[PDB]
Each structure stands twice: as C-alpha cells, then as structure tokens.
C-alpha cells in the first residue's frame, strides 16, 4: 500500500505506518498525533475529529462519541441500556440493533455504530494519505481483547465502509506488545502484562508469548475508568472554587462546564511533565474569567482513590492467569493516562521496582504495533 495500522479508541484514534524499518505515527491537519473519536452533525455539515470535538460544548445533542461502546452490540444489552442514560445524543432501536439518531441539515437521521466509526476511520485514512501522498487501502485495525465475534465483525465493517481493506483485526494488548518487539522468538515462553489506562476504559491484559504466537492468559479492568474521570474530579474541584470566589454556581451551564473540562484536560496533561499548571478561561460564566492553577500534588489527591484502584484489576488479572508478580517478564504502558507520574509510581511500586516499557507514547503504542503487523501482512 503501504498498509497502515489504525487504533480506533473510545476517546482518541491513532494511525501509523511502517516504512524503512521504522514506524511513523502520523499527525493530523492540526499536528496532533491522535485524533478525537468524535463526529458531529449540524444544519450544514458533518464534522469529524478535532473539528467535531472543538464544538461539542455547543452542539451536545448532535455530537456523537462512544460509538465503540455500541459497536457489535444489541439494543437490549444491559450495558447499552445503561450507557444510554449518560449520552446526550439519542440511541434508537432498529430491529434490535442500536443506532444513533441525530439532526443533520434539518432532517432526522440515524447511523449504525459502524457507520459512525467508519467516519472516524475515513479521517484516519485521509490523515495517512495526506502524509504518504499515496492512496491508502490496506490496514490492520485493533480492538479491545474482550471483543466478541460480533463486535469484531462490526469493527471490520467500519473499515470496509471507510474504503479500507482490513487485513486483520488484532487485539490492542497484542499490538502493544508487538510495538516493543515482544513477539520476537527467544526460545521459551514469556509472560507480558499490558496496563492500558485510556480516556474512558482501563484494561489489564496478561499475554503469554512463544514462537511469535500470542495467548491471552487473562483480562481485567473497568470499562468506565479512564482519563475523563480524572478530568471530572478536577472539574468538580474548580466548580467549587469558582463558587467560593464568585458565589456563583456554573454547574447548570452545560457549556461552561464543558469549557472548564477542556481546560482541565489540558492542565492534566501538563501535570504529567510539570508540577503545576495554569487554567485561564475567558467568559466562563456571566462574563467572569476564571484564572487559577493546580499543583500535581493537588491533582493526585483529587484522584488518589481512582489511581490506587487500578492495582485491583492487576492483582485480579495475575490471579486469573495463575501468575505471581515475579513471573511477569515485561510491563507495557498503554493509554494516555499512563503518562501520569503517580500511576507509573503505583504500578512500579506494586511490581517491586520493575522497570516499565514506556518509551513509546502510550496513546500511540497500539497503532505503532498495528502498523508493524500491517507491514508484515502486506
Ligand atoms: N500527558 C498526558 N497526561 C495525562 N493524561 C494524558 C496525557 N496525554 C493524554 N492523556 C489522556 O489520555 C486519554 C486518551 O488516551 P488514549 O488516546 O489512549 O485513549 P483511547 O484509546 O481512546 O482510550 P480507551 O482505550 O480507554 O478508549 C485522555 O483521557 C487524555 O486526557
Ligand atoms: Cl485532521
Ligand atoms: Cl504512591
Ligand atoms: K486510541
Ligand atoms: K483502554
Ligand atoms: K477498553
Ligand atoms: Mg486505547
């Protein structure tokens, strides 16, 4: 093609291409190495990625996200029914299949999850093509290891709809392991633990690898734990702060909250590299600006319980895999949230000082491995 590797995440998607013995994680039009898995519909246009997320605060009802939580599932599924209660967009039942319903150009329209995901994939495909200056057709698309046949089929379909020839659908943890060359033959079997804390989900997977063959020994985690929850803790903290300083509660102003959240998410990223971050919002509420700051220590305390809780699934995964900590040959960090220093400390401490594989940007590791595999299969 060359063939590309695409990591379709619940919050962000990433595309990479292997060329000249090296993987290139491709930046988008805005120079971002990952793209929001968002799609929006307006009176005049369909927006995807950065353009869609950049307007979610003003168009919550027609801005779709979390299609990954619906893909391949039935409308009557317990989790689907539960998730619906939290989404600002409508999810309808079409013969037992869930579809997101939105307004586009003044008319009501509905899309299957795979159609929404195909839109995101199309964006990733175009991002790769702009970089390569060539048409991209072949691709390896990844999915959470626990995905069933239906979810895998629907994901492949999303690719096909986008004009991609899906060479293979592979597990995210396996892609991560491949990124670090853990698939190479070294004689005996090796146990690898993948600690994946993304934007909306937490996945711990223990893989056993031998002769280039992967076996998913166990999986654990929380489908509703991720970076967004950390942003939430910060949002609540600042709503309280604004209330103290201005005797005004911004909680019911959906837009103000979303704008504060965006500022929090950015502040959070800064706290992974610096011990303090500044938040400066204009016209947050009733023309009142919100200029303040937060320390790394403060950020850690606001999320202490959530951070510490990530170790429970690690213990469970080990137990289910019938392995002691000492039997894990490698620990691979995946997901943007694993860039948080406190998370790395907790995991490393749990593993008695064992070093973590974190040289590859965690939020790019899956796409990196998928790109390598795509090359191999091409
Ligand atoms: N430097 C950073 N420090 C802390 N968090 C970060 C950093 N960079 C990105 N993140 C967070 O990582 C999350 C995105 O991670 P990633 O791109 O792995 O998500 P994803 O694959 O869509 O998630 P999931 O697999 O849970 O669906 C967001 O919550 C983002 O705020
Ligand atoms: Cl773009
Ligand atoms: Cl600690
Ligand atoms: K992703
Ligand atoms: K994840
Ligand atoms: K997941
Ligand atoms: Mg992910």
From Swiss-Prot:
Record flagged with keyword Phosphoprotein: yes
One GO BP: synaptic vesicle uncoating
UniProt PTM comment: Acetylated.
Induction: Constitutively synthesized.
Cell compartments where the protein resides: Cytoplasm; Melanosome; Nucleus, Nucleolus; Cell membrane
Any Gene Ontology CC annotation: plasma membrane
Domain of life of the source: Eukaryota
Annotated positions binding ADP: 11-12, 199, 265, 268, 272, 336
Keyword Transferase included in the entry's annotation: no
Annotated region described as Nucleotide-binding domain (NBD), given as residue ranges: 1-378
Keywords from the named record: Acetylation, ATP-binding, Autophagy, Cell membrane, Chaperone, Cytoplasm, Hydrolase, Isopeptide bond, Lysosome, Membrane, Methylation, mRNA processing, mRNA splicing, Nucleotide-binding, Nucleus, Phosphoprotein, Repressor, Spliceosome, Stress response, Transcription, Transcription regulation, Ubl conjugation
Tissue distribution of the protein: Ubiquitous.
N6-succinyllysine: modified positions: 316
Gene Ontology MF, one: ATP hydrolysis activity
E.C. numbers: 3.6.4.10
Entry remark concerning the domains of this protein: The N-terminal nucleotide binding domain (NBD) (also known as the ATPase domain) is responsible for binding and hydrolyzing ATP. The C-terminal substrate-binding domain (SBD) (also known as peptide-binding domain) binds to the client/substrate proteins. The two domains are allosterically coupled so that, when ATP is bound to the NBD, the SBD binds relatively weakly to clients. When ADP is bound in the NBD, a conformational change enhances the affinity of the SBD for client proteins.
Family note: Belongs to the heat shock protein 70 family.
Subunit structure: Component of the chaperone-assisted selective autophagy (CASA) complex consisting of BAG3, HSPA8/HSC70, HSPB8 and STUB1/CHIP. Identified in a IGF2BP1-dependent mRNP granule complex containing untranslated mRNAs. Interacts with PACRG. Interacts with HSPH1/HSP105. Interacts with IRAK1BP1 and BAG1. Interacts with DNAJC7. Interacts with DNAJB12 (via J domain). Interacts with DNAJB14 (via J domain). Interacts (via C-terminus) with the E3 ligase STUB1 forming a 210 kDa complex of one STUB1 and two HSPA8 molecules.
Protein name per the record: Heat shock cognate 71 kDa protein
Origin species: Bos taurus
Residues of the full protein shown: 4 to 381 of 650
């Amino acid at each position: 093609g060359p063939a590309v590797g695409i990591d379709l995440g619940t919050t962000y998607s990433c595309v990479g291409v292997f060329q000249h013995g090296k993987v290139e994680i491709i930046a988008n039009d805005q120079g971002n190495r990952t793209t929001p898995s968002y799609v929006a519909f307006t009176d005049t246009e369909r927006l995807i990625g950065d353009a869609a997320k950049n307007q979610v605060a003003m168009n919550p009802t027609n801005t779709v996200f979390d299609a990954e939580r619906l893909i391949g599932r039935r409308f009557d599924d317990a989790v689907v029914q539960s998730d619906m209660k939290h989404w600002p967009f409508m999810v309808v039942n079409d013969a037992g299949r869930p579809k997101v319903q939105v307004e586009y150009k003044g008319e009501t329209k509905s899309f299957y999850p795979e159609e929404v995901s195909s839109m995101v994939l199309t964006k990733m495909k175009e991002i790769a093509e702009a970089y390569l200056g060539k048409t991209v057709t072949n691709a390896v698309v990844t999915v959470p290891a626990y995905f069933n046949d239906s979810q895998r089929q629907a994901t492949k379909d999303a690719g096909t709809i986008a004009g991609l020839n899906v060479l293979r659908i592979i597990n995210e943890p396996t892609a991560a392991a491949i990124a670090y060359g853990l698939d190479k033959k070294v004689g005996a079997e090796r146990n690898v633990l993948i600690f994946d804390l993304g934007g909306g989900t937490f996945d711990v997977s223990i893989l056993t690898i031998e002769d280039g063959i992967f076996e998913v020994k166990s999986t654990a985690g929380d489908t509703h734990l991720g970076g967004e929850d950390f942003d939430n803790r910060m949002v609540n903290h600042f709503i309280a702060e604004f209330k103290r300083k201005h005797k005004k509660d911004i909680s019911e102003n959906k837009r103000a909250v979303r704008r504060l959240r965006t500022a929090c998410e950015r502040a959070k990223r800064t706290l992974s590299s610096s011990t303090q971050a500044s938040i400066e919002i204009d016209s947050l509420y009733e023309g009142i600006d919100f200029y303040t700051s937060i320390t790394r220590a403060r950020f850690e305390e606001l999320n202490a319980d959530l951070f510490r809780g990530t170790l429970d699934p690690v213990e469970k995964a080990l137990r289910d895999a019938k392995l002691d900590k000492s039997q894990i040959h490698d620990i691979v960090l995946v997901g943007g949230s694993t860039r948080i220093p406190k998370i790395q400390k907790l995991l490393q401490d749990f593993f008695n000082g064992k070093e973590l594989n974190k040289s590859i940007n965690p939020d790019e590791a899956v796409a990196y491995g998928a790109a390598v595999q795509a090359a191999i299969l091409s």
